[PDB]
Design a protein around this ligand. Structure first.
Ligand SMILES: *[C@@H]1O[C@H](CO)[C@@H](O[C@@H]2O[C@H](CO)[C@@H](O[C@H]3O[C@H](CO)[C@@H](O)[C@H](O[C@H]4O[C@H](CO)[C@@H](O)[C@H](O)[C@@H]4O)[C@@H]3O)[C@H](O)[C@H]2NC(C)=O)[C@H](O)[C@H]1NC(C)=O
Ligand SMILES: *[C@@H]1O[C@H](CO)[C@@H](O[C@@H]2O[C@H](CO)[C@@H](O[C@H]3O[C@H](CO)[C@@H](O)[C@H](O)[C@@H]3O)[C@H](O)[C@H]2NC(C)=O)[C@H](O)[C@H]1NC(C)=O
Ligand SMILES: *[C@@H]1O[C@H](CO)[C@@H](O[C@@H]2O[C@H](CO)[C@@H](O)[C@H](O)[C@H]2NC(C)=O)[C@H](O)[C@H]1NC(C)=O
Ligand SMILES: *[C@@H]1O[C@H](CO)[C@@H](O[C@@H]2O[C@H](CO)[C@@H](O)[C@H](O)[C@H]2NC(C)=O)[C@H](O)[C@H]1NC(C)=O
Ligand SMILES: *[C@@H]1O[C@H](CO)[C@@H](O)[C@H](O)[C@H]1NC(C)=O
Ligand SMILES: *[C@@H]1O[C@H](CO)[C@@H](O)[C@H](O)[C@H]1NC(C)=O
Lengths: 177, 111, 109, 46, 177, 177
């Protein structure tokens, strides 16, 4: 949307990742699979949860109509009473409707942001040890087994440890053979 | 051997000032601005120049009709606001009623 | 200190005419939009008396013959028409800023 | 003061106050809140 | 947060940079040190300052309660008076509180944006004359003395002047040293 | 502004591109020219148009003053009527003005987002078949004619098809000319 990730350079989502909002798909000799990023997914949940609660909470005090009756010669204050009570119903309704519209935009873009940011987390870890494919995926220049995959997902990826194997591949690759 | 470096970064300090956000409460920030005054001085005062008419145990009725116990207020100088207790002891010493009393008080709000 | 200087020092005016006594403040005596000047009358042989508060309004029980006027740095007490029982020395005093300071005073004949 | 409240006078530059809604003079604007603070700086680390 | 720079790919801020909100840490043969980009920091201060005034200014007119008294048989209008006056206090309190909450988010993300943009300003200056390390730092492929650092901080960095030295190092890097 | 593109790393806009808000300038042997990206421009127009309509529409019901008259001993309800009616004019005026200011920011930041995302659509297509110059432009490592330009602008750029020609050029560049 604003951050260009959800329905942007990452086109469409993964029907097959059910245990979180954001995560990874990996693919190597040892198989393939989906995996949620727990911490980002949790931050999203904390955020949206606090957000929904804050909306509920701020609307807690708010105008409460009361019935008052008036006789046939108290029409002016009866009208003044109606227009007053309607006046506030209109205000709170505007505030409520407009808050929802504005916060939905914020929520959707929040997610868009979260995803870009998760993508950028991997990007700046791997650097030139992997090739940016343009679709949300990275292709390693070195072998990355299930242990290595987990290291990327949890912040523990050691660049120096693989940097040698990576540079060796690019060399073969650059000459064209 | 290591090479030279430049880093991009941002200010931190020993502030424990805190702001709220729709998504997150009690966010600790480097700098902040309070915009609510919660303090007063507990006294009734002259307003711009002008001392208020502070009736004591007299009521507005008591004053205008000139209940004997309100003699202190027989002839008051220009005032800025009037101050009246919730239940002035010196009101209508002779029991009765003061017509459109509230509408009159409303008139005083402009005098 | 806000030095207050009245002028003239002594004023002799014909009966039924206009006395015009001036006051001049070293710095202004005039914020909140109102002037904090006051005029006082000392009829001979007795304590001073309050005529005008905040430079323009008469104290209760003061005849209209007394015109309080002025703003800022200079003011003027105008007595007109002058009556018999107006022999006195007149004082202007400011309340804008401690220490409360008075004028020299003006004696009317 | 420039501002008087039934519980006491206010001497303040703040845009808001929470003392009492019935004021006279040149006052800040009354709100029911206990706390109002704008962020100006940025998010503090430790 | 939204831009992923503050408390994101740059984890935590610099206690030792006191003369600004955003800035640089450099480290070379002649020593090390903090500096500040005055101009970006200034735009932020200008921005936040206008924002705070704009909030104050729009809240300038706003409901002001007045006391009115009513007798023992005007209870209905007395109640209508109460509820009316309360009604606006609730509305303005809502407007004010929500404005604070909403603009704080904008303000904090503003800063986050400002730090990313500054990083990106530097990133697209240096290109392959430096190596992106991923934590907010760049490691140069060439020697960058105190004059050269200042040129980077002020947008003055001359890429052509070092590009020859940078490519020579990468060459030694490919060889393995 | 927030995304750093409009009046940021792309400094100033193109007076000579009239058929859209965002687009391309291309330059090769066969000439030069401007071209709008129809799809982004239309989404922007769609976006801003819905926004303006949504603003108009939410402000559709809103307080409407009515004249009521009162006699010389109804000063209290006449005042309560006045302050009440004024009370709402102030709320709605606040609502309108603040809505305009907040949405102007959103609109301006929206555009900034659209340009960044468009640039990034091109960036992740070309990758190392072109060189990022840092000013909003890409310089190709291979010849890209009028047909090839069109393929880039509309999503159709074939990376594998030119990738061979690009790597050959980078080798000459490495020799230094
Ligand atoms: C983030 O993910 C990282 C990647 O998994 C974690 O680093 C790894 O931590 C341990 C170090 O003790 C280790 O992972 C284990 O996973 C293997 C799965 O096949 C396992 O087979 C290894 O050995 C195990 O089994 C043998 C016997 O068969 C025993 O001798 C071992 O003691 C063990 O029980 C292996 O230990 C990896 O060495 C290490 N990764 C790398 C790349 O070195 C991080 O711990 C994790 N961080 C957090 C905070 O969770
Ligand atoms: C996006 O625009 C592209 C450029 O027009 C277009 O690709 C083009 O489509 C066909 C491929 O079959 C070719 O069009 C014809 O052009 C010349 C005219 O002189 C003919 O002689 C050719 O034989 C050919 O039939 C273009 O060569 C081709 N261009 C490129 C760079 O591939 C895409 O189809 C457009 N995208 C979509 C989704 O429609
Ligand atoms: C925040 O407080 C800490 C602790 O009070 C400061 O740390 C001190 O730093 C000075 C010099 O920078 C040293 O001489 C002290 O020994 C440090 N204190 C301790 C307990 O180690 C820190 O500098 C403060 N930060 C700021 C921005 O003022
Ligand atoms: C935000 O921080 C404030 C200040 O630390 C918290 O206020 C405290 O609340 C607890 C119980 O909730 C009380 O025991 C303390 O006395 C409060 N502190 C003060 C100074 O009054 C507040 O609870 C925090 N809010 C959230 C949502 O975490
Ligand atoms: C006081 O004198 C001024 C100036 O001559 C005059 O305009 C004003 O009417 C006088 N005030 C009274 C109450 O006569
Ligand atoms: C940045 O450097 C240029 C060239 O040395 C100079 O003209 C300009 O004033 C500098 N700007 C700042 C803010 O130091």
């Amino acid at each position: 949307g604003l951050f260009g990730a959800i329905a942007g350079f990452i086109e469409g989502g993964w029907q097959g990742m059910v245990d979180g909002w954001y995560g990874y798909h990996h693919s190597n000799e040892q198989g393939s699979g989906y995996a949620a990023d727990k911490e980002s997914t949790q931050k999203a949940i904390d955020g949206v949860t606090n957000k929904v609660n804050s909306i509920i909470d701020k609307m807690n005090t708010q105008f409460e109509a009361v019935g008052r009756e008036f006789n046939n010669l108290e029409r002016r204050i009866e009208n003044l009473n109606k227009k007053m009570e309607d006046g506030f119903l209109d205000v709170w309704t505007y505030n409520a409707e407009l808050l929802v519209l504005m916060e939905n935009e914020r929520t959707l873009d929040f997610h868009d942001s979260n995803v870009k940011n998760l993508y950028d987390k991997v990007r700046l870890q791997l650097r030139d040890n992997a090739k940016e494919l343009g679709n949300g995926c990275f292709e390693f220049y070195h072998k990355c087994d299930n242990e290595c995959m987990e290291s990327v997902r949890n912040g523990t990826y050691d660049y120096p440890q693989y940097s040698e194997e990576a540079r060796l591949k690019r060399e073969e690759i650059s000459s064209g053979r | 051997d290591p090479g030279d470096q430049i880093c991009i970064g941002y200010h931190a300090n020993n502030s424990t000032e805190q702001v709220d956000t729709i998504m997150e409460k009690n966010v600790t920030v480097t700098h902040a601005q309070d915009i609510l005054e919660k303090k007063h001085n507990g006294k009734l005062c002259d307003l711009d120049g002008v001392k208020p008419l502070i009736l004591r145990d007299c009521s507005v009725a008591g004053w205008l009709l000139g209940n004997p116990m309100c003699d202190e207020f027989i002839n008051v100088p220009e005032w800025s606001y009037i101050v009246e207790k919730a239940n002035p002891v010196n009101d209508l010493c002779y029991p009765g009623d003061f017509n459109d009393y509230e509408e009159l008080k409303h008139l005083l709000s402009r005098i | 200190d806000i030095v207050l200087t009245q002028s003239p020092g002594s004023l002799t005016v014909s009966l039924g005419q206009r006395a015009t006594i001036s006051c001049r403040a070293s710095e202004s005596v005039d914020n909140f939009g109102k002037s904090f000047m006051h005029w006082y009358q000392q009829k001979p042989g007795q304590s001073p008396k309050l005529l005008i508060y905040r430079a323009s309004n008469r104290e209760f029980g003061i005849p209209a013959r007394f015109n309080g006027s002025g703003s800022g740095t200079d003011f003027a007490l105008t007595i007109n028409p002058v009556e018999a029982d107006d022999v006195a020395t007149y004082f202007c005093q400011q309340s804008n800023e401690d220490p409360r300071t008075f004028g020299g005073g003006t004696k009317l004949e | 003061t420039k501002c008087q409240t039934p519980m006491g006078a206010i001497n303040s530059s703040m845009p808001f106050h929470n003392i009492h809604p019935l004021t006279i003079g040149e006052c800040p604007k009354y709100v029911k809140s206990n706390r109002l603070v704008l962020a100006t700086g940025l998010r503090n680390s430790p």
